[PDB]
Design a protein around this ligand. Structure first.
Ligand SMILES: *[C@@H]1O[C@H](CO)[C@@H](O[C@@H]2O[C@H](CO)[C@@H](O[C@@H]3O[C@H](CO[C@H]4O[C@H](CO)[C@@H](O)[C@H](O)[C@@H]4O)[C@@H](O)[C@H](O[C@H]4O[C@H](CO)[C@@H](O)[C@H](O)[C@@H]4O[C@H]4O[C@H](CO)[C@@H](O)[C@H](O)[C@@H]4O)[C@@H]3O)[C@H](O)[C@H]2NC(C)=O)[C@H](O)[C@H]1NC(C)=O
Ligand SMILES: *[C@@H]1O[C@H](CO)[C@@H](O[C@@H]2O[C@H](CO)[C@@H](O[C@@H]3O[C@H](CO[C@H]4O[C@H](CO)[C@@H](O)[C@H](O)[C@@H]4O)[C@@H](O)[C@H](O[C@H]4O[C@H](CO)[C@@H](O)[C@H](O)[C@@H]4O)[C@@H]3O)[C@H](O)[C@H]2NC(C)=O)[C@H](O)[C@H]1NC(C)=O
Ligand SMILES: *[C@@H]1O[C@H](CO)[C@@H](O[C@@H]2O[C@H](CO)[C@@H](O[C@@H]3O[C@H](CO)[C@@H](O)[C@H](O)[C@@H]3O)[C@H](O)[C@H]2NC(C)=O)[C@H](O)[C@H]1NC(C)=O
Ligand SMILES: *[C@@H]1O[C@H](CO)[C@@H](O[C@@H]2O[C@H](CO)[C@@H](O)[C@H](O)[C@H]2NC(C)=O)[C@H](O)[C@H]1NC(C)=O
Ligand SMILES: *[C@@H]1O[C@H](CO)[C@@H](O[C@@H]2O[C@H](CO)[C@@H](O)[C@H](O)[C@H]2NC(C)=O)[C@H](O)[C@H]1NC(C)=O
Ligand SMILES: *[C@@H]1O[C@H](CO)[C@@H](O[C@@H]2O[C@H](CO)[C@@H](O)[C@H](O)[C@H]2NC(C)=O)[C@H](O)[C@H]1NC(C)=O
Ligand SMILES: *[C@@H]1O[C@H](CO)[C@@H](O[C@@H]2O[C@H](CO)[C@@H](O)[C@H](O)[C@H]2NC(C)=O)[C@H](O)[C@H]1NC(C)=O
Ligand SMILES: *[C@@H]1O[C@H](CO)[C@@H](O[C@@H]2O[C@H](CO)[C@@H](O)[C@H](O)[C@H]2NC(C)=O)[C@H](O)[C@H]1NC(C)=O
Ligand SMILES: *[C@@H]1O[C@H](CO)[C@@H](O[C@@H]2O[C@H](CO)[C@@H](O)[C@H](O)[C@H]2NC(C)=O)[C@H](O)[C@H]1NC(C)=O
Ligand SMILES: *[C@@H]1O[C@H](CO)[C@@H](O[C@@H]2O[C@H](CO)[C@@H](O)[C@H](O)[C@H]2NC(C)=O)[C@H](O)[C@H]1NC(C)=O
Ligand SMILES: *[C@@H]1O[C@H](CO)[C@@H](O[C@@H]2O[C@H](CO)[C@@H](O)[C@H](O)[C@H]2NC(C)=O)[C@H](O)[C@H]1NC(C)=O
Ligand SMILES: *[C@@H]1O[C@H](CO)[C@@H](O[C@@H]2O[C@H](CO)[C@@H](O)[C@H](O)[C@H]2NC(C)=O)[C@H](O)[C@H]1NC(C)=O
Ligand SMILES: *[C@@H]1O[C@H](CO)[C@@H](O)[C@H](O)[C@H]1NC(C)=O
Ligand SMILES: *[C@@H]1O[C@H](CO)[C@@H](O)[C@H](O)[C@H]1NC(C)=O
Ligand SMILES: *[C@@H]1O[C@H](CO)[C@@H](O)[C@H](O)[C@H]1NC(C)=O
Ligand SMILES: *[C@@H]1O[C@H](CO)[C@@H](O)[C@H](O)[C@H]1NC(C)=O
Ligand SMILES: *[C@@H]1O[C@H](CO)[C@@H](O)[C@H](O)[C@H]1NC(C)=O
Ligand SMILES: *[C@@H]1O[C@H](CO)[C@@H](O)[C@H](O)[C@H]1NC(C)=O
Ligand SMILES: *[C@@H]1O[C@H](CO)[C@@H](O)[C@H](O)[C@H]1NC(C)=O
Ligand SMILES: *[C@@H]1O[C@H](CO)[C@@H](O)[C@H](O)[C@H]1NC(C)=O
Ligand SMILES: *[C@@H]1O[C@H](CO)[C@@H](O)[C@H](O)[C@H]1NC(C)=O
Ligand SMILES: *[C@@H]1O[C@H](CO)[C@@H](O)[C@H](O)[C@H]1NC(C)=O
Lengths: 123, 439, 123, 123, 48
C-alpha cells in the first residue's frame, strides 16, 4: 500500500514506520530568478548533510532504522508501548518530545563515542 | 525487555511550519510562446507531466491565508520581474521637452492631445519637429504642456517585443520542504482543514494585476466564498470569490497609428500617430443578467455575517487616489482605468442588455504603488478586444444597515485569492521514539 | 595494472570490475564566467548524492560491490554467467538493460525496506 | 571533560583521541557580499565530501575510528607505541608524516579494493 | 599533469556537425566580448 510521500502522516507511528522509505526517497530528489533556485537547491542539500551527519555520528550510519544503547528516561512523557506505537502519530509525538529533543541528541552521539574507543581496545 | 531504549527513525512524517526560497514552473508550450521572453519564463524550470498529488488522510492542519508568506514572495517576485524587464529597454530621458498641444479633431469634451515638440535626432546636432498624441492622463500643463511624470520620476519605455500577457505560474519548494493544499469546498482560508493533501507545485496562477474586480482567478466551489481577516473591523478588505464567472468584454475601438521617431543613435521612441476612424473611447461590457444574480448571491452570504434581516447597500469608491477608485487592468498592452459606479449602485432589503463602463487610458504608469519607476507602454495598433472572467471582488466597509465600496491599492491581496489553499512546511525526518531493542 | 579512469571500458564486465575503484575515485574530484564553474561544480555533487542515496537505500551503503536478495528475472536478456562476465562490456550491457533499469531499481529499495523492519523484530 | 572544538590540540594523540567526536561535530555545522558566504559555504561541503569519500573508499565508511590491513613501514618515522600515543601531538605528528601521507593514502584504497572482490567470492 | 588515457578496444561514434562544445564556445566568446565593453568609454556624443 504505497500511500505516497508523507502518505502516513495521520497513521500511527507503528503504521507510519512502514512508509519510512517513502518519505526519505523524496527527501533529496536527484541572470536573476535563475538564482532563486540555486540558493534554494543549495539549502536543500545542507539540510540533507545536517541530518545524515547526525545519522553518522550516532550508531546508525546505515539508514531508516537503528537502535541505541541509551536508556529512555521516564520524564520524557511516560507512555507505554501500546500507547505510542498503536495510538499516536509522529506529528503528535514530536510535539511532546520537542522539549527534550536537544537533550536526547547529545546522549546518542556520546554513548556512541564511548562504544568506538572500547571497540578499538577489543581488536 | 521491560526497560525501554531510544531508537532513531529517519524518514518520518514530521513537519513544522517554516519559510524557504520558492521557485517557478511553467509548462513547455508556454516556452514556445517565445516572443523574446514574454513576462518571466526563460531559464525557469519546465513543469513535468506528472502532476503528483497525495491526499493525507486523517490529517488536519491549520492554515492561515492572511499570514501566508507565498504572498510576500509572490508580490516581491512580480515586483522584480517588472524591473528586470525594463533595465535594458529604451530610456526616455530626453523626452521631457516642452509640449505644445491641442485638442483632437472633433466637433464637446476634450480627452486627448495632439502634441508637437523638439527632439534629439540621432546626431547630436539638428533637432526634430515631430508630433505625438497623448491621453490627458499622460500630460499636464505649466504656466503649453509637459508629460505628467517629468516632475517626479525619470522615465523608461517598455520594450515592444515583450508581452504583458499573464501566463500560468507554478510556484514550488525545494527538497526537505513541501506544500499543503486544502481540498474542501468551504474554507475561509483560516482555521483547521479536514481534507488536507500535499503537492509539490501549486496550480497555474496567472499574475493578473487588477483592482476592484478580480480577473481570471480560480472559481470557488458550491456557495460563493466570503473571506475576511476581521469581519468586525471595517479596516480590512473583504475578499470575495465567485462560483459562476461573470463575463466582461473590453474593446479599444480606436484604429490608432504607431509613429517611430528615432531619438538615436540606436534608441527610438514609439508615439501615437493620427487616428484612423471614429473618435470613441474604451468600454467594458458586463451582461445585465449575469451581474444581478451574482450580486444577490453574495449578499445572501453577507447576511450570514451582518445579521439575518439587515439591509446591505453598495456605493462607488470613497475617493483618494486614482488606482483605488478605478478598475485598473491590462489587456492588449494598454492600461485601462474604468468607472465602477454602475456595478456598485445597489440597495438590498432583507428579502436584457449590457452594463457598459467608461474606461480611460494611460501610457505612463507607476505600478504596485511605488516600484519600477514609470513605464510608457508603447501604443497599440488596431482595435484591441479581450474577454476576462470576473471571479471575485475586493470590497471595503464604511464606519441597522451596512454599506460596502470597492477597494484595492495594495497588490498583495490579488495573490491571496489564489494562494488561500497553500502553505509551506519543512520536513524533519529525524524523530526519536522508544522500543524494547538494544544493540 | 592501473589502466586509469574508465581504463576498462572495452574490457569485459568481469575484467572491468577490477577497476571499479579507479572510476569512482575520480567521480567527485575534491562576476560572470566565474559562475560557469559554480553552477557546474554544484551539478557535480548533486549527481553524487543522487547516486549515493540509491546506494544508501539499497543493501549497499558501503561502496563498490554489494549483493541483494532480489531474484533476477529471465526476461531481462537471459544470458549466462560466462556470457556476461567473460563476453560483454558494461557499455554493451546497460544497452540491453536500459529498458529494465527503472523496473529493477524499485525492487532493491523495497526488498531492503522489508529487511530492516524484520531486523527490528529480531533485536 | 568536554574541552571543546580542537580542545585537545596540545594533548597527546592518545589524549586527543577522546575528543575525536568534538572536532567532527563542528566540521560541517548545519546582490553581492551575500555571495561571499555562498561561494564559501559551498567550499565548506566539498571539503566534507572530499574527506568522507576517502573514509568511504577505505575500510572505514562508519566514522571516527577504523583499522586497515596495511602494515606500517618503519621508514615513516620509527617511533614506538608509548613514544607516539603518550608523547606527541597530532600537529607534531602530521609534521613528520606530511611527506608520506600521499604514499600511504594509496595503499588504504588499494588494500581495500582487494578485500571487496575477495568478499564477493566467499558469498 | 596533462592526464590522457587511451581507452583500448573502445569505439565511439563522434559527430562534429552536432557538437555542443561549439554552441557553448561561440556563445561564450560572444559574452566575453560584451563583459569587456560594459565598463569602457561610450562614444554617445561622437555622432556629430
Ligand atoms: C483573461 O484571460 C483571457 C484568455 O486568455 C484573456 O484574453 C486574451 O486577450 C488578449 C488581449 O489582451 C489576447 O491577445 C491577443 O489576441 C489577438 C488575437 O489573436 C488572434 O490570432 C490567434 C492566432 O495566433 C487566434 O488563435 C485567435 O483566436 C485570434 O484570432 C492577437 O492578435 C495578439 O497577438 C499579439 O500578441 C501576442 C502576445 O501578446 C504575440 O505573441 C503576437 O505575436 C502578437 O503581437 C504582435 O503581432 C503583430 C506581429 O505579427 C504586430 O503587428 C502587433 O502589433 C503585435 O506587436 C494576442 O494574442 C488573447 O488572445 C486572449 N486570450 C485568448 C486565449 O485568446 C484576457 O486578456 C485575460 N484578462 C486579463 C485582464 O488579462
Ligand atoms: C496633429 O497635428 C499635426 C500638425 O502638425 C497634423 O499633421 C499634419 O496633418 C495635415 C493634414 O491636414 C498635413 O497637411 C497636409 O499635407 C499634405 C502633404 O503635402 C505634401 O505635398 C505637397 C505637394 O503638393 C508637397 O509640396 C509638400 O512638401 C508635402 O510633401 C498635403 O497634401 C495636404 O493638402 C491637402 O489638404 C488641404 C487642406 O486645406 C487641401 O486644400 C488640399 O487640396 C490637399 O487635399 C495637407 O496640407 C500636414 O502636413 C501634417 N503635418 C505634419 C508635420 O505631418 C496631424 O494630422 C494631427 N493629427 C490628428 C489626429 O489630427
Ligand atoms: C457638430 O457639432 C455641432 C455642435 O457643436 C452640432 O450642432 C448641434 O446640433 C444639435 C442637434 O444635433 C443641437 O441641439 C439641438 O438643440 C435644440 C434646442 O435649441 C433641441 O430642440 C434639439 O432637439 C437639439 O437637441 C445643437 O444646438 C447644435 N449646436 C450648435 C452649436 O449648432 C452638429 O450637429 C455637429 N455636426 C456634425 C456633423 O458633427
Ligand atoms: C523648437 O525649437 C525652435 C528653435 O529651433 C523654437 O523656435 C524658436 O522659438 C522661440 C520662442 O519659443 C523664438 O523666439 C525663436 O525665434 C524661434 N526660432 C529660433 C530660435 O530659431 C521652437 O519654438 C521650438 N518648438 C517648441 C518648443 O515647441
Ligand atoms: C507633479 O505634478 C502633478 C500634476 O500636476 C502633481 O499632482 C498634483 O498634486 C496635488 C497635491 O496638492 C493635487 O491636488 C493635484 O490634483 C495633483 N494633480 C493631478 C493632475 O493629479 C504633483 O504634486 C507634482 N509633484 C511635485 C510638484 O513634486
Ligand atoms: C473562519 O472560519 C472558521 C471556521 O472554519 C471560524 O472559526 C470559528 O471562530 C469562532 C470565533 O469567531 C469560534 O467561536 C469558533 O469556535 C470557530 N470554529 C471553528 C470550527 O474554527 C472563524 O471565525 C472564521 N473567520 C472569519 C474571519 O470568518
Ligand atoms: C472563464 O470561465 C469559464 C467558465 O465557464 C472557463 O471555462 C471553463 O474552463 C474550465 C477549465 O479552465 C473547464 O473545465 C470548463 O469546462 C470550462 N467551461 C466551459 C463551459 O467550457 C474559462 O476557462 C475561464 N477563462 C479564464 C479563467 O481565462
Ligand atoms: C486600421 O487602419 C489600417 C491602415 O493604417 C488598416 O490597414 C489596412 O487593412 C486593409 C485590409 O485589412 C488593407 O487592404 C490595407 O492595405 C491596410 N492599410 C495599410 C496602410 O496597411 C486596418 O485595416 C484598419 N483596421 C481595421 C480593423 O480595419
Ligand atoms: C462578449 O463577447 C462575446 C463574443 O465576443 C459574446 O458572446 C457572443 O454572444 C452572442 C449572443 O449574444 C453569440 O451569438 C456569439 O456566438 C457569442 N460569441 C462567442 C465567441 O461565444 C458575449 O455575449 C459578450 N458579452 C458581453 C457582456 O459583452
Ligand atoms: C461616485 O458616484 C457619485 C454619484 O453617485 C459621484 O458624485 C458626483 O461627483 C461629482 C464630482 O466630480 C459632482 O459634480 C456631482 O454633483 C456628484 N453627484 C452626486 C449625485 O453627488 C462621485 O463623483 C463618484 N465618485 C467616484 C470616485 O466615482
Ligand atoms: C463615474 O460615474 C459617475 C456616475 O456615473 C460620474 O458622476 C457624474 O459626475 C458629473 C460631474 O462632472 C455629474 O454631472 C453627473 O451627474 C454624475 N453622474 C451621476 C450619475 O451622478 C463620474 O464623473 C464618473 N467618473 C468618475 C471618475 O467618478
Ligand atoms: C443608481 O441607480 C438608479 C436607478 O436604479 C439611478 O437612478 C436614476 O434616476 C433618474 C431620476 O432620478 C432616472 O431618470 C434614471 O432613469 C435612473 N437611472 C436608471 C438606470 O434607471 C441612479 O442614477 C444610479 N446612480 C448612479 C450614480 O449611477
Ligand atoms: C531523567 O529526567 C529527570 C528530570 O525529570 C532528571 O532529573 C534525571 O537525571 C534524568 N535521568 C538521567 C539518568 O539523567
Ligand atoms: C514544553 O516546555 C514548555 C516550556 O518550555 C511547556 O510550556 C510545555 O508544556 C512543554 N511541553 C510538554 C508537552 O510538556
Ligand atoms: C481641449 O479641449 C478642452 C475641452 O473642454 C478645451 O477647454 C481646451 O481649451 C482644449 N485645448 C486646446 C489647446 O484647445
Ligand atoms: C477585530 O476587530 C475588533 C474591533 O475592531 C477588535 O476588538 C478585535 O480584537 C479584532 N480581532 C478579532 C475579533 O479577532
Ligand atoms: C435585478 O436588479 C433589480 C435592480 O435593478 C432588482 O430590483 C431585482 O430584484 C433584481 N432581480 C432579482 C431576480 O434579484
Ligand atoms: C436566519 O434565518 C433562517 C431562516 O429564516 C435561519 O435558518 C437561520 O438560522 C437564521 N440565521 C441566524 C439566526 O443567524
Ligand atoms: C518477469 O518478467 C515478466 C515479463 O517478461 C513478468 O510478466 C513477470 O511478472 C516477471 N517476474 C516477476 C517475479 O515479477
Ligand atoms: C527496449 O525497448 C524498446 C522499446 O521501448 C525496444 O525497441 C528495444 O528493442 C528494447 N531493447 C532491447 C535490448 O530489447
Ligand atoms: C618501506 O620504505 C622503504 C623506503 O625507506 C621502501 O624502500 C620499502 O619498499 C617500503 N616497504 C614496502 C613494503 O614497500
Ligand atoms: C620531508 O621531506 C623533506 C624534503 O622533501 C625533508 O627536507 C624533510 O626533512 C622531511 N621531513 C621529515 C620529518 O623527515
Amino acid at each position: 500500500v504505497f500511500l505516497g510521500f508523507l502518505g502516513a502522516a495521520g497513521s500511527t507511528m507503528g503504521a507510519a514506520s512502514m512508509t519510512l522509505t517513502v518519505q526519505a526517497r523524496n527527501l533529496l530528489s536527484g541572470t536573476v530568478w535563475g538564482i532563486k533556485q540555486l540558493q534554494a537547491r543549495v539549502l536543500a542539500v545542507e539540510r540533507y548533510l545536517r541530518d545524515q551527519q547526525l545519522l553518522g555520528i550516532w550508531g546508525c550510519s546505515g539508514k531508516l532504522i537503528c537502535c541505541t544503547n541509551v536508556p529512555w528516561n521516564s520524564s520524557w512523557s511516560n507512555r507505554n508501548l501500546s500507547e505510542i506505537w498503536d495510538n499516536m502519530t509522529w506529528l503528535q509525538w514530536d510535539k511532546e518530545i520537542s522539549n527534550y529533543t536537544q537533550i536526547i541528541y547529545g546522549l546518542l552521539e556520546e554513548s556512541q563515542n564511548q562504544q568506538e574507543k572500547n571497540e578499538q581496545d577489543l581488536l | 525487555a521491560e526497560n525501554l531504549w531510544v531508537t532513531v527513525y529517519y524518514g518520518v512524517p514530521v513537519w513544522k511550519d517554516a519559510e524557504t526560497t520558492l521557485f517557478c514552473a511553467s509548462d513547455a508550450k508556454a516556452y514556445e510562446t517565445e516572443k523574446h521572453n514574454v513576462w518571466a519564463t526563460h531559464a525557469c524550470v519546465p513543469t513535468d507531466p506528472n502532476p503528483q498529488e497525495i491526499h493525507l488522510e486523517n490529517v488536519t492542519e491549520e492554515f492561515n491565508m492572511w499570514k501566508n508568506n507565498m504572498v510576500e514572495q509572490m508580490h516581491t517576485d512580480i515586483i522584480s520581474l517588472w524591473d528586470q524587464s525594463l533595465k535594458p529597454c529604451v530610456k526616455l530621458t530626453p523626452l521631457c521637452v516642452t509640449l505644445q498641444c491641442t485638442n483632437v479633431t472633433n466637433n464637446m469634451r476634450g480627452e486627448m492631445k495632439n502634441c508637437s515638440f523638439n527632439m534629439t535626432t540621432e546626431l547630436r546636432d539638428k533637432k526634430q519637429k515631430v508630433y505625438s498624441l497623448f491621453w490627458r492622463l499622460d500630460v499636464v500643463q505649466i504656466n503649453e504642456y509637459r508629460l505628467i511624470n517629468c516632475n517626479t520620476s525619470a522615465c523608461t519605455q517598455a520594450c515592444p517585443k515583450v508581452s504583458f500577457e499573464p501566463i500560468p505560474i507554478h510556484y514550488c519548494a525545494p527538497a526537505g520542504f513541501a506544500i499543503l493544499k486544502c481540498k474542501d469546498k468551504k474554507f475561509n482560508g483560516t482555521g483547521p482543514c479536514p481534507s488536507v493533501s500535499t503537492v509539490q507545485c501549486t496550480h497555474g496562477i496567472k499574475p493578473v494585476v487588477s483592482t476592484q474586480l478580480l480577473l481570471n482567478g480560480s472559481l470557488a466551489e458550491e456557495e460563493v466564498m466570503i473571506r475576511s481577516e476581521n469581519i468586525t473591523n471595517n479596516a480590512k478588505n473583504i475578499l470575495v470569490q465567485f462560483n459562476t464567472p461573470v463575463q466582461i468584454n473590453c474593446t479599444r475601438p480606436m484604429n490608432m497609428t504607431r509613429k517611430s521617431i528615432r531619438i538615436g543613435p540606436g534608441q527610438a521612441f514609439y508615439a501615437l500617430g493620427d487616428i484612423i476612424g471614429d473618435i470613441r473611447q474604451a468600454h467594458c461590457n458586463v451582461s445585465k443578467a449575469t451581474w444581478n444574480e451574482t450580486l444577490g448571491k453574495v449578499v445572501k452570504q453577507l447576511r450570514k455575517h451582518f445579521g439575518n434581516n439587515t439591509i446591505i447597500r453598495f456605493a462607488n469608491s470613497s475617493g483618494g487616489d486614482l488606482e483605488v477608485t478605478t478598475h485598473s487592468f491590462n489587456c492588449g498592452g494598454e492600461f485601462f482605468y474604468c468607472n465602477t459606479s454602475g456595478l456598485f449602485n445597489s440597495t438590498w432589503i432583507s428579502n436584457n442588455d449590457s452594463i457598459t463602463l467608461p474606461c480611460r487610458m494611460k501610457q505612463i504608469i507607476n505600478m504596485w504603488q511605488r516600484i519600477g519607476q514609470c513605464m510608457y507602454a508603447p501604443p497599440i495598433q488596431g482595435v484591441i478586444r479581450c474577454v476576462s472572467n470576473i471571479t471575485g471582488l475586493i470590497l471595503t466597509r464604511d464606519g441597522t444597515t451596512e454599506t460596502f465600496r470597492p477597494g484595492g491599492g495594495d497588490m498583495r491581496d490579488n495573490w491571496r485569492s489564489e494562494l488561500y489553499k497553500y502553505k509551506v512546511v519543512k520536513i524533519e525526518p529525524l524523530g526519536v521514539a522508544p522500543t524494547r531493542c538494544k544493540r
